[PDB]
Design a binder for this molecule. Sequence first.
Ligand code: HEM
Ligand SMILES: [Ca+2]
Ligand SMILES: [Ca+2]
Ligand SMILES: [Mn+2]
Ligand SMILES: [Mn+2]
Length: 367
Amino acid sequence: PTAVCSDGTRVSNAVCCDFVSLGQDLQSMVLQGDCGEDAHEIIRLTFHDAVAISRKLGPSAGGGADGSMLLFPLVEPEFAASNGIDDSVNNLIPFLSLHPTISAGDLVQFAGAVALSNCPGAPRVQFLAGRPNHTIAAIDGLIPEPQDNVTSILERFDDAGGFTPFEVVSLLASHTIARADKVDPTLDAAPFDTTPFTFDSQIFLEVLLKGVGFPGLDNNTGEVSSPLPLGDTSTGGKDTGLMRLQSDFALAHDPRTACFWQGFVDQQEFMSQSFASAFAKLAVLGHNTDDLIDCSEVVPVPKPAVDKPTTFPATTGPQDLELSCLAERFPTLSVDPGAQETLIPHCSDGLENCTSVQFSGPATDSP
Ligand code: HEM
Ligand SMILES: [Ca+2]
Ligand SMILES: [Ca+2]
Ligand SMILES: [Mn+2]
Ligand SMILES: [Mn+2]
């Protein structure tokens, strides 16, 4: 039966109402309404928590979206594939006691939904509640790494939850708001696209440009050359140059995924809807949706997509593209004016001095 919540929201089930105050606390205490560092790491955690599940190995290998990352913070966060995930994990642990009617699995996925809503252009994702509050730690080896090839990547997603190559590329839209802190031991927050605080299709276009150099070292595992490597870090600045993952490069050029990859370029609505569909499927891995309840209405309405069209970043152009998809012509797009590479801002407000909430906690990371 229906009820209305404290902020006035109509809900199909009154047990959805407990998520209202949780969302408010996630914003006030961690996310701060920003599509910033803390939001990005929390979105990354939804994937690390959910994908640790295997059809072929059976339930003992992992329970998927079950909050195992939070309930066993001394196990999975410290596996090599998850180096750096401790930040999100430690930020979320306190909410377990603060909102004890909400399972760790629900907490992770709801935090991800709220985090996404802070990012201009992101979809309002489905949110189902009712994941059980108990599980066990997954085994190591279930999380794809940037050095993995496409066959491996596709097999892992298929084994986790029957994701198709389209769904995999759709999920990787998330790298439109992604940066790397661990891939290069000399770099902090190296962005994967020129708008890491905007949920747009720049990532799809920019992975297709010819690489020309590196923002840091030239020999990091899982990293390939970037088309826009220049930053201001060599002189003490925080605007790290753009980084490209080997896995993104490979997905953009593999015959199984290349057309899906390019298909999202300058297709904002198609990209956000496709991400939303694949993400909703990721969010319930390890669960039958019949055992869950629909609490989608308590997901905040996201910031709207920006006005700006998809364009070539300064100093780049269509002549720099490496195309692989024969089925669809790459669209004609404007080029941003400028003779020099434009620094990619370290903060959503365009400055370099922003700071982020970080709670201390039991999960740890390595350099
Ligand atoms: C083949 C699959 C994937 C690979 C190889 C991969 C790899 C990576 C790597 C290497 C980083 C940088 C981590 C660091 O050094 O700090 C990263 C960050 C990130 N990942 Fe992915 N990822 C994959 C899929 C996904 C999916 C499915 C999602 C979400 C649906 C996701 C969301 C994110 C986000 C939001 C960040 C940014 C975190 C931040 O900026 O602080 N990734 N990913
Ligand atoms: Ca898990
Ligand atoms: Ca972006
Ligand atoms: Mn960190
Ligand atoms: Mn990060």
